[PDB]
């Protein structure tokens, strides 16, 4: 068993975490439990405070002079570690290994919260990633309001994710009538994995004398961003410009294969991606699972995926929503290019 | 007389805009990281610094009542830089308001097209447009020796007399209409669209930079409205009669309030920043550890 460790530049504070991927179940988020190690000194008349903050950084300025930081908080939780719920197995083992100067902290995440989604920065950028980020900050203070120096503090980036549900969803179907040009479309399944190809049926029948001459199929990413007002960003991640046509009073059935990936969608600035601990690259942002009916507006970034087929008549289009998730890992995701450099 | 207060305003603007704009340029162009929120303010400070550097020539020209002993080149250049500031500052404020509106409302566009290269292109376009608009002022003005005084004036009495008194009218009409109405109306529309469209109207009040932009916009509008209003009133009632005696002593106040505007910005930054007031008065890497089991 191996646990993560980060220390402050001062060298008097260190936060021990055992995992950095706290999985969000639709109604129960995993708890952020850990242990902070402090010298017998440096705490004679002070207190240890651990703060878990979720931010929605939307600009790479970071200038705390005139409000030019663009690091608005979304959920702030504060706990008291040094001044004295049952401890978990990880906290008990960490305390025994470290010693008596080991104070455990536990955070509970309320449900219906945004996950770690970071927009694609772009080639010529040297700033922080834009998106929802979860930050674990531990410092030493006795008033909870005095300014804390960067040297005398510990900051750790944790990532909350959602994985594919065990039970597969219903098969997506769609059909619209236009004047008739009946267009039917359906996928093979509802839950898809990253890199797994998507098969769509474009079985279409035509009855009018008008003839189509172009079939357009695309997979679009629906990143609902809401901080000041409700906004929706639609970016296509897959493209297939077929040149199939159907004669009047005849049918046409075909199966098309699509696969979204980041190699071609690299120049698309602002594209939603998974949470990034560092400047390393990550795959496309997964979908966001939300409670049915019992969920209000989620202030943050919500990622949705819809594949559409369009009959360019000279247009009739339908929407097929699908779910893109990573499968449940065995041990843990590394959050890094495993063959670095 | 309103001449002494005009001199006081000019001197105050110079002394309060040289070092403030200098330090703003130093912070936003040489120390802070280049990101597109303070490049507009850096260009604003550059324009203000150029205008205040050319201001002492006009200050000396006006301290002694009406006499310009410098060459015709400086006589053209000081007015050219004055109009260049007058247009570039308001254009930069307009693009600041547009960038703010796009960033807060419709963030999809602002998350893809808000590149630093686009900012440089916009800055270059603004500078070229301001220079093109101010060029007529650079070309028309010259010097004349009247009553044993060498004074600068706009040569609207060029060789053709029929076209004279019309070139001035169309020139000042274009100047006022564009440089006042278009930025002010666009900025008012942007601000009225920011409000009534952002739900839960308390996120804007929460000590963010919205007030920083709003204060600068309000100060600029307040300082530059009397000059334009007086100019348009003079245009309207100039051909009627000469009964307006207060107009002669009225426009010197605005001509100098608009100049103190160029220096008010550092004072506004000081006022809206507590920490900057305080100074004015004066990461490791993640490792890993074993676990027994």
């Amino acid at each position, epitope marked *: 068993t191996r646990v993560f*460790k980060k*220390a*402050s530049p*001062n*060298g*008097k*504070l*260190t936060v021990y975490l055992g995992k950095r991927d706290f999985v969000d179940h639709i109604d129960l988020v995993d708890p952020v439990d850990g242990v902070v*190690l*402090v*010298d*017998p*000194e*440096y705490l004679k008349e002070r207190r240890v405070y651990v703060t878990l903050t979720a931010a929605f950084r939307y600009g790479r300025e970071d200038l705390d002079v005139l409000g030019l930081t663009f690091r608005k908080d979304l959920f702030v939780a504060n706990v008291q570690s040094f001044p004295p719920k049952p401890l978990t197995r990880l906290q008990e083992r960490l305390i025994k*290994k470290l*010693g008596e*100067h080991a104070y455990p902290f536990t955070f509970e995440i309320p449900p219906n919260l945004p996950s770690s989604v970071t927009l694609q920065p772009g080639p010529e950028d040297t700033g922080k990633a834009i998106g929802v980020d979860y930050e674990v900050k531990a410092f030493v203070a006795e008033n909870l309001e005095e300014k804390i120096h960067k040297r005398n503090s510990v900051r750790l980036v944790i990532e909350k994710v959602q994985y594919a549900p065990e039970r597969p969803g219903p098969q997506p179907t769609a059909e619209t009538t236009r004047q008739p040009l009946h267009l039917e479309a359906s996928l093979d399944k509802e839950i898809y994995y990253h890199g797994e190809p998507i098969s769509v049926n474009v079985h279409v029948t035509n009855n009018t004398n008008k003839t189509v001459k172009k079939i357009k199929i695309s997979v679009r990413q629906y990143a609902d961003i809401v901080l000041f007002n409700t906004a929706q960003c639609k970016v296509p991640v897959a493209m297939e410009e077929a040149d199939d046509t159907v004669a009047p009073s005849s049918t046409f059935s075909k199966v098309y294969t699509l696969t979204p990936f980041l190699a071609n969608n690299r120049e698309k600035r602002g594209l939603a991606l998974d949470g990034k601990l560092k400047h390393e690259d990550t795959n496309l942002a997964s979908s966001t699972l939300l409670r049915e009916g019992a969920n209000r507006e989620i202030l943050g970034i919500i990622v949705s995926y819809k594949v559409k087929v369009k009959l360019v008549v000279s247009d009739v289009a339908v929407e097929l929503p699908f779910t893109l998730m990573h499968p449940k890992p065995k041990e843990e995701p590394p959050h890094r290019e495993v063959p670095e450099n | 007389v309103v001449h002494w207060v005009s001199l006081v305003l000019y001197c105050l603007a110079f002394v309060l805009g040289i070092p403030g704009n200098a330090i703003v340029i130093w912070f936003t162009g040489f120390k802070w990281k280049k990101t597109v929120t303070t490049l507009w303010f850096l260009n604003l400070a550059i324009a203000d610094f150029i205008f205040l550097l050319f201001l002492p020539l006009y200050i000396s020209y006006v301290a002694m009542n009406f006499h310009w002993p410098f060459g015709i080149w400086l006589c053209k250049a000081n007015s050219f830089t004055a109009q260049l500031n007058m247009f570039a500052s308001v254009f930069f404020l307009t693009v600041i308001s547009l960038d703010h509106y796009i960033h807060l409302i419709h963030p999809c566009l602002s998350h893809r097209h808000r590149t630093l290269k686009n900012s440089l292109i916009v800055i270059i376009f603004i500078w070229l447009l301001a220079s093109l608009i101010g060029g007529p002022a650079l070309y028309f003005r010259d010097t004349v020796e009247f009553n044993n005084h060498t004074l600068c004036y706009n040569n609207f009495q060029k060789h053709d007399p029929d076209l004279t008194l019309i070139r001035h009218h169309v020139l000042t009409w274009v100047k006022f209409i564009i440089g006042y109405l278009f930025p002010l109306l666009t900025m008012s529309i942007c601000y009225l669209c920011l409000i009534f469209k952002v739900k839960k109207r308390s996120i804007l009040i929460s000590s963010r930079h919205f007030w920083t932009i709003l204060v600068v916009v309000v100060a600029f509008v307040v300082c530059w409205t009397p000059y334009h209003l007086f100019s348009i009133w003079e245009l309207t009632i100039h051909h009627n009669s000469y009964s307006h005696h207060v107009m002669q002593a009225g426009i010197p106040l605005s001509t100098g309030l608009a100049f103190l505007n160029s220096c008010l910005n550092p004072i506004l930054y000081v006022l809206i920043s507590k920490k900057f007031q305080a100074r004015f008065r004066s990461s*490791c890497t993640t*490792a890993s*550890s*074993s676990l*027994a089991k």
Partner: nanobody
Amino acid sequence: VQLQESGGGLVQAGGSLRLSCVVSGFFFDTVTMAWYRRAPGKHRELVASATAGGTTTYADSVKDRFTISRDNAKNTVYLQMNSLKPEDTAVYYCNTFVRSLSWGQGTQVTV
């Protein structure tokens, strides 16, 4: 940044050793330093520590046997051992009580 430890030796039971470790790149003036060891085939446990000002602490089977001193002139802390036990063999590491600094290569001592 760089931690070099020396002072090992194949000293039999009842002997004494004078171990030293140099911490370069870290200014530990108010920072408490400690000493850690691994028995062959076991995990690392704290064996001694000493606060910045005046207080030094030890583990259970360390009192009246081991002593720890620190000197800020050369940025080096000392760990002297007396009356070595047959189980005292281990690999001793030099680091902060917080374990903030990167771990170095310890010294092998056997009895």
